[PDB]
Amino acid sequence: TYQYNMNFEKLGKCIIINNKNFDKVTGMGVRNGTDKDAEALFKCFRSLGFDVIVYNDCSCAKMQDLLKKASEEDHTNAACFACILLSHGEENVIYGKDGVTPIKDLTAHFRGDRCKTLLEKPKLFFIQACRGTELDDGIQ
Amino acid sequence: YKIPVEADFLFAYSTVPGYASMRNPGRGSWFVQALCSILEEHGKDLEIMQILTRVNDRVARHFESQSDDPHFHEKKQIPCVVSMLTKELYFSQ
């Protein structure tokens, strides 16, 4: 009763958003190295037992619609859901190639009342993006 | 009977709020490198918080920035886990 029930037909979906190239108007540079991220994540989460899907250079509209549709899918036979975001970012927001969108709007598609087939099931979001401009100088 | 709508979420951010995130163009971003490395070696036997805590440690200890720009010189990073989970999570058994 202390662990999530993992006995389902499938572990679940793993959505990887791999934003590398951005419209110049956004002022965002090419995110070199992100292909290595997406590649390693793909291999890893496949190994865990996820049905992994990789999307590349998505627009904000694409990212929104994509996650919305995933939330509307039938997850009854899935233990959990996972999504990984690889992009530019600022606090509370993540970059599509044509601009920014709030993290909360993306994840809200999977709320309990809005994705009933993932009710009582873990919903995992891994975010590789900036959250501001501060840097940690460290100590020691 | 009822369950909160915001429940059973977990957010593994690569960095704390207000801060930047580091990405090496050759080997990839720090957070993802570390996350994968730990999942490959403990994905099937450790609980999710144990995994992400070890990831926090790895990014913190194993990495430190280099740059011939002085404003990106000697820099560090710590990831950020936000958990609304109501159970322990194992990816097996």
Partner: peptide, 4 residues
């Protein structure tokens, strides 16, 4: 190293 670069910044996201």
């Amino acid at each position: 190293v670069e910044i996201x």
